Design a protein around this ligand. Structure first.
Ligand SMILES: C[C@@H]1CC[C@@]2(OC1)O[C@H]1C[C@H]3[C@@H]4CC=C5C[C@@H](OCCC(CO[C@H]6O[C@H](CO)[C@@H](O[C@H]7O[C@H](CO)[C@@H](O)[C@H](O)[C@H]7O)[C@H](O)[C@H]6O)CO[C@H]6O[C@H](CO)[C@@H](O[C@H]7O[C@H](CO)[C@@H](O)[C@H](O)[C@H]7O)[C@H](O)[C@H]6O)CC[C@]5(C)[C@H]4CC[C@]3(C)[C@H]1[C@@H]2C
Ligand SMILES: CCCCCCCCCCCCCCCCCCCCCCCCCCC(=O)N[C@@H](CO)[C@H](O)[C@H](O)CCCCCCCCCCCCCC
Ligand SMILES: *Cc1c(COP(=O)(O)O)cnc(C)c1O
Lengths: 177, 500, 65, 555
């Protein structure tokens, strides 16, 4: 081969994505991403609060007990955020040749800058939500444990300094570099 | 107790994350530690850049511009009057053998009348992009006519032929794909391969064993890898080579692509309008069907059809994808109307009668037989063109080149590769320039002594990636008479013998 | 100077003046319907549009109760 | 019915055809002269924004659309495979394209596809003829009937009204066809060159003001096949983020390192240059060979002018090189029509490389590059298009020469100035009226391109459709071409339009925007800092007189 442009699928329990070469990194990432640029814009921080309020109202219109409304809104918001951000790997439209085929949106936010104000806000929101919501199901221990597990294992662990570009081959042999 | 402690634990970590590092960056490929501001300005003031363009070798390489012929107030035809060296030398009534137009059907009266009517009723400028009120309901007619004439499902137009291949191939390939291409493709194909960003392999020029072995090894490796999905694969070649002039064995390629599940991409710039009983293309030559034999076909309208532009042929899905996935199609203006109408009229005329193709084939065969069976030129030059080709290519024997200039093709190729790899500012090679000067001297001698104009292969060695050598080219067209061509062949042979 | 161009009369100007003179008791409903339709995503839909309009009417009835 | 019909041209008298193509001036008071800014720097422009609930509604609509599209895609391609045969593997062959890479075109744009790619016929002058069609299914296929109707032209790249069928340019083109045939021999190096090409090159070089220039058949190829001639892997390129695709393709083919700076940020550019000069090459820390800065004259999407004096000062201080694109600025801006160099007063010798395109303003097809003597001498030998591509035909050359001579003033005196004044006055009048009505308009005071903001998604199709019922043609753009919040409609003005047509357009746009609730102005657009909600009659009566004063424009 005179170019050697191949994608590897090495198999290991814990693995990381390789650093990009000069051609892939310095040259193929020059134009705006158009996928994570919208995060820092006008009115892009109140939408989360609006969504939470609308979800709470919608779940309250059914007429359930106070505990179940809060549990349902917590779980649905966290699951939706995880599905939108931390699940898909790639971009919905060709960028240059497929340079962003191994990074999620959370890893594409702010051009791979670890600690930015928007990331701090997006990590602070779940903690405040849990602290507000837990006052309504303190008596029941099972609901407390389930909500704590959902908040920590899904809404906090993926957002860490560690577990960045981290891959596990249990659900499938992933493609790194 | 237990409940209170958990709440405090989450709160405490939120403060630490808020008071994190000062926006830690990403580890790039270059970095330098901190140093005092005061000594930074010394580095800024000590920087010395290079000139935008190197003027050192301009004077020695400037003889190419002064030798370019210029036509004086008449269309390019068989007999022209030319001036050279800023009107310093002038020649009148010069026989021409350096025109790419073969059929010469675009100079007839009906085409001129159609062009005049289209100009009167439509204008000269398209004035709009492809998607913003650009189509002038003649582009659709031309597309339908091309699709019906060439026996396919659809065709897409392009403003320029040189920017057709580098715009369609990258749209269907990305990283992780496999492309197998011949080692004699032209410059636009090389640019398309470079912009494709995919794995590229090379096999020997017209050798089926190498292609079969490469395909077998790749298929075995892919089967062993057990990939979740099947990547896209392609085979790249062309009908008649622009630098050599040979032909492609279509049946073997079809059999191999059917056996190993590949796809075929073919450039037909020099084959459309010259091969086949009527002129359909390469498929008619071997008595096959273009619908199944070839998957992607690229053609140009300027060589023989007589108007600027190009086209890409295929099925409905590919054209629909190209409508939005081609950079050249989306971000460029539409083609004018008179060219479209003239091309449609030429297609109708070619469908009506097929005498020009027969005359062109007879002339090409006669020229090849004249320059193929001469024994006095055996020790000096060789012919590297197929008998069915309409352009004759002549090269020098390796023994003569080694005797005179003392260099070989492999050494030149490796020297150029090393210079390109090291990224040198100045790239000058002496024996190549000497050989080019010798060929230009031959051409000038022929033109001065016998009033016959022939061309020389104009290439830029810096942009080339594959081996190539200078050569001479002779063209033909259907409008000439056999007597003049017969006289010109002997004249060129005499000039070649006299120069050597 | 005359050109072969046809001019469409403007509504509320020689359109609702000469032909007919009825423009009352329907402006409010038209405005409400236009606002409701334009401020919600309906045109890029096909028959999930019906399902969503039913959803919103149901929220309305239940919440009003 | 399925195929697009071939329309026979109508028979009309000559005067009516001329009126259809080019308008006729009514009064001499509708002309404005453009001044040159000698010593005034450009202030940073100010933008206006709507209230929050518009943005929140846009976000909610996009979320709903994305969720529904993904759910439908999954369910349809899981529970039935016979209908979706073009997206699945068949007998060991991969499909042409992928599911995820073409989601937006398949699920978002296919629902309003009738708003794009409208076929037309005839000359694209003041009034453009459009062919009637009926959509079937949901914009899947179309049925055509033999009916064509005229519409007002506001979507064509005709700035000076040179797209005419009767005039000096058409006669010159016909005479050129009679003399030189439509055949081109081949590449310019072999046989292709003629004396007409030399004349055109000399005329372009004299017109621009530089020392030498070259011409090419296609504008896109000019950028595509230029940067690889004098650039390699040891050079740095700094370019704005809002650049055309051709420049990006050329830089990608070149292979040099690329860095970008935010739009209209001089401090960021200075910091980037100061950092990159010291940092050096990767993995070796040697100094860079050279630094090139690429910029555009006028940006078509927003109509904003680049800051030329600051760029010149920076390149003089740090010893860099300058490349300027002038696709939308040549022949339409400045007191005479030379370009941004005449507007800012900067000498043309300071800019290293200049580009231009003949398609926008001269009614032809081609491009040109301008530079000094030795640079052009080296580039002629080092270029690829010269010795590998075709050559521009004679009629286009004749049309371009006639247009350039008319603009310069050598032939047909008193025509270029008239067109320039008309286009300037029309642009300023439309911009001022639209801003006074209560809309949001971007761009500088005198820019041919007027973008009008339509924030909500559902407001983009309907608007256009309404304008189709009132005989007006418009062009709309949205995501991903533009930012998510900003979906807009672009107005392209011509020098052929008349003030009465502008009044008709203003009335219809005012009524449509009133119906669709598109008036959202925060009072920062006015020069006196108050909200403006004027009546249409008062605007029409007062705007033409106050259009001349430059104190009513914030930027
Ligand atoms: C309470 C209630 C309970 C019930 C419920 O509601 C709630 O529960 C709910 C649970 C819901 C799902 C939850 C989450 C997802 C994933 C989401 O996101 C993936 C979106 C797409 C994009 O991303 C992927 O695709 C990219 C493009 O390939 C990848 O790119 C590169 O990846 C690698 C490099 O990185 C390299 O390979 C290459 O460079 C390149 O490939 C990228 O990596 C990867 O991530 C993918 O979508 C497609 O995925 C499949 C493949 O196209 C399609 O399947 C088909 O595919 C084959 C056809 O023969 C057969 O095998 C299957 O059988 C046959 O079905 C499927 O239909 C379709 O959706 C799409 C929606 C979905 C499914 C939801 C649907 C609705 C529910 C079922 C609800 C439900 C109603
Ligand atoms: C109808 C009914 C639904 C009504 C609404 C339901 C409400 C659900 C509540 C969940 C809330 C979680 C989200 C809150 C945070 C976001 C708030 C603002 C969102 C604005 C969106 C602006 C546009 C973004 C476009 C950027 C983009 O193209 N990103 C791509 C990345 O590659 C991807 O396209 C994208 O990200 C991920 C796509 C794949 C995931 C989509 C969901 C898949 C199916 C969902 C069904 C799940 C199962 C049944 C519930
Ligand atoms: C409009 C545009 C073009 C179009 O080029 P054509 O060859 O006329 O289609 C080229 N360059 C730029 C910068 C443009 O904006």
């Amino acid at each position: 081969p005179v170019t050697d442009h191949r994608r590897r699928r090495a198999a290991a329990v814990i693995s990381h994505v390789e650093q990009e070469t000069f051609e892939d990194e310095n040259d193929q990432q020059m134009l705006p991403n158009m996928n994570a640029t919208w995060v820092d814009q006008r009115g892009a921080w109140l939408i989360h609060i609006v969504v939470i309020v609308l979800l709470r109202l919608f779940y309250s219109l059914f007429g359930s007990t106070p505990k179940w409304t809060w549990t349902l809104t917590n779980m649905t918001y966290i699951i939706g955020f995880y599905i939108m951000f931390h699940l898909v790997k790639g971009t919905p439209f060709d960028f240059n040749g497929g340079a962003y085929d191994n990074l999620t949106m959370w890893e594409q936010i702010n051009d791979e800058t670890l600690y930015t104000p928007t990331r701090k806000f997006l990590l602070i929101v779940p903690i405040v939500l849990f602290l507000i919501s837990n006052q309504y199901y303190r008596n029941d221990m099972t609901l407390f444990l389930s909500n704590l597990a959902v908040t920590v294992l899904i809404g906090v662990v993926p957002k860490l300094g560690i577990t960045h570009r981290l891959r596990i081959s249990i659900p499938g042999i992933t493609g790194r570099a | 107790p237990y409940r209170t402690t958990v709440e405090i634990g989450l709160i405490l970590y939120g403060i630490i994350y808020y008071l994190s590092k000062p926006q830690q960056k990403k580890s790039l490929q270059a970095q330098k530690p901190n140093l005092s501001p005061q000594e930074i300005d010394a580095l800024i003031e000590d920087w010395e850049p290079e000139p935008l363009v190197d003027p050192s070798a301009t004077d020695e390489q400037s003889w190419r511009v002064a030798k370019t012929p210029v036509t004086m107030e008449m269309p390019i035809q068989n007999h022209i009057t030319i001036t050279r060296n800023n009107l310093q030398e002038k020649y009148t009534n010069v026989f021409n053998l350096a025109s790419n137009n073969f059929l010469q059907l675009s100079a007839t009266e009906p085409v001129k009348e159609v062009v005049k009517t289209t100009i009167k009723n439509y204008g000269v400028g398209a004035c709009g992009p492809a998607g913003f009120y650009g189509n002038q309901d003649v582009h659709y007619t031309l597309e339908y006519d091309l699709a019906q004439f060439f026996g396919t499902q659809g065709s897409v137009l392009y403003g320029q032929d040189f920017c057709a291949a580098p715009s369609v191939l990258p749209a269907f390939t990305k990283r992780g794909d496999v492309i197998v291409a011949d080692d004699q493709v032209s410059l636009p194909v090389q640019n398309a391969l470079q912009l494709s960003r995919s794995t590229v392999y090379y096999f020997n020029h017209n050798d089926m064993n190498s292609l079969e072995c490469l395909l077998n090894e790749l298929t075995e490796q892919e089967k062993l890898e057990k990939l979740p999905a099947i990547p896209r694969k392609f085979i790249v070649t062309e009908g008649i080579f622009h630098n050599s002039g040979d032909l492609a064995p279509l049946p073997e390629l079809t059999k191999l692509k059917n056996k190993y599940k590949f796809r075929l991409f073919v450039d037909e710039t020099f084959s459309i309008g010259v091969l086949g009983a009527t002129g359909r293309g390469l498929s008619e030559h071997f008595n096959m069907d273009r619908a199944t034999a070839i998957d992607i076909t690229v053609g140009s309208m300027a060589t023989a059809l007589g108007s600027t532009g190009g086209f890409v042929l295929g099925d409905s899905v590919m054209c629909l994808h190209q409508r939005i996935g081609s950079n050249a199609y989306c971000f460029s203006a539409c083609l004018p109307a008179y060219t479209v109408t003239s091309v449609s009229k030429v297609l109708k005329l070619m469908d009506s009668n097929n005498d020009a193709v027969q005359t062109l084939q007879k002339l090409s065969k006669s020229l090849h037989d004249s320059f193929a069976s001469d024994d006095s030129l055996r020790s000096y030059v060789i012919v590297t063109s197929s008998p069915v080709s309409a352009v004759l290519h002549l090269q020098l024997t390796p023994a003569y080149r080694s005797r005179k200039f003392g260099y070989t093709c492999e050494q030149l190729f490796e020297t150029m590769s090393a210079l390109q790899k090291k990224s040198q500012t100045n790239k000058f090679i002496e024996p190549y320039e000497e050989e080019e000067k010798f060929l230009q001297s031959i051409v000038d001698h022929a033109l001065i002594n016998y009033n016959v104009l022939i061309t020389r292969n104009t290439i830029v060695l810096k942009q080339e990636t594959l081996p190539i050598v200078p050569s001479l080219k002779i063209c033909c067209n259907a409008a000439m008479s056999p007597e003049e061509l017969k006289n010109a062949c002997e004249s060129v042979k005499q000039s070649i013998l006299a120069c050597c | 100077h005359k050109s072969s161009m046809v001019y469409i009369p403007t509504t509320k100007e020689a359109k609702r003046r000469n032909g007919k003179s009825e423009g009352i008791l329907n402006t409010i409903e038209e405005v409400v319907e236009k606002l409701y339709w334009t401020y919600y995503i309906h045109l890029p839909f096909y028959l999930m549009a019906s399902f969503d309009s039913f959803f919103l009417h149901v929220f309305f009835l239940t919440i009003f109760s | 019915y399925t195929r697009v019909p071939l329309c026979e041209p109508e028979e009309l008298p000559d005067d009516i055809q001329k009126e259809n193509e080019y308008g006729t001036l009514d009064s001499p008071g509708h002309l404005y002269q453009v001044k040159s800014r000698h010593g005034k720097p450009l202030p940073e422009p100010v933008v206006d924004t709507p209230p929050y609930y518009i943005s929140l509604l846009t976000y909610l609509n996009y979320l709903i659309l994305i969720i529904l599209g993904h759910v439908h895609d999954f369910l349809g391609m899981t529970f039935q495979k016979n209908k979706h045969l073009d997206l699945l593997e068949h007998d060991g062959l991969a499909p042409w394209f992928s599911n995820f890479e073409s989601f937006y075109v398949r699920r978002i744009k296919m629902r309003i596809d009738d708003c794009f790619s409208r076929p037309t016929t005839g000359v694209p002058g003041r009034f453009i003829r459009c062919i009637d069609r009926i959509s079937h299914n949901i914009n899947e296929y179309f049925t055509y009937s033999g009916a064509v109707y005229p519409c007002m032209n506001l979507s064509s790249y005709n700035y000076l009204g040179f797209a005419q069928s009767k005039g000096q340019c058409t006669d010159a083109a016909l005479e050129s066809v009679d003399k030189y045939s439509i055949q081109s021999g081949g590449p310019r190096a072999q046989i292709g060159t003629t004396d007409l090409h030399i004349k055109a090159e000399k005329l372009v070089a004299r017109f621009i003001g530089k020392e030498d220039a070259l011409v090419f058949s296609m504008g896109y190829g000019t950028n595509a096949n230029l940067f690889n001639a004098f650039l390699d892997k040891k050079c740095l390129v700094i370019s704005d983020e809002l650049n055309h695709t051709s420049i990006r393709t050329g830089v990608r083919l070149s292979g040099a390192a690329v860095r970008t700076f935010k739009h209209g940020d001089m401090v960021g550019l200075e910091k980037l240059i100061r950092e990159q000069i010291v940092l050096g090459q990767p993995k070796t820390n040697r100094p860079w060979k050279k630094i090139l800065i690429c910029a555009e004259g006028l940006f078509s999407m927003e109509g904003t002018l680049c800051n030329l004096p600051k760029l010149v000062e920076l390149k003089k201080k740090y010893k860099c090189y300058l490349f300027i694109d002038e696709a939308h600025s040549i022949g339409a801006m400045g007191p005479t029509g030379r370009g941004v160099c005449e507007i800012f007063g900067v000498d043309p010798k300071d800019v290293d490389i200049l580009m231009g395109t003949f398609t926008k303003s001269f009614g032809a097809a081609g491009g040109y590059i301008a530079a000094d003597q030795w640079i052009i001498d080296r580039l002629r030998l080092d270029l690829t298009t010269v010795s590998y591509s075709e050559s521009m035909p004679a009629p286009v050359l004749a049309q371009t020469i006639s247009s350039l001579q008319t603009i310069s003033g050598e032939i047909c005196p008193g025509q270029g100035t008239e067109r320039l004044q008309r286009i300037a006055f029309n642009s300023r009048y439309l911009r001022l009226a639209l801003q006074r009505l209560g809309f949001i308009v971007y761009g500088v005071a005198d820019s041919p391109v007027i973008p009008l903001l339509l924030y909500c998604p559902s407001k983009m199709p309907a608007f256009s459709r309404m304008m189709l019922q009132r005989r007006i043609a418009v062009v709309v753009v949205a995501y991903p071409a533009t930012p998510l919040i900003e979906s807009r409609v672009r107005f392209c003005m011509s020098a052929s339009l008349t003030k009465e047509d502008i009044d008709y357009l203003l009335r219809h746009v005012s009524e449509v925007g009133d119906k669709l609730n598109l008036k959202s102005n925060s009072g920062k657009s006015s020069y006196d800092g108050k909200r403006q909600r004027w009546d249409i009659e008062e605007v029409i009566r007062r705007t033409p007189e106050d259009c001349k004063d430059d104190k009513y424009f914030v930027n």
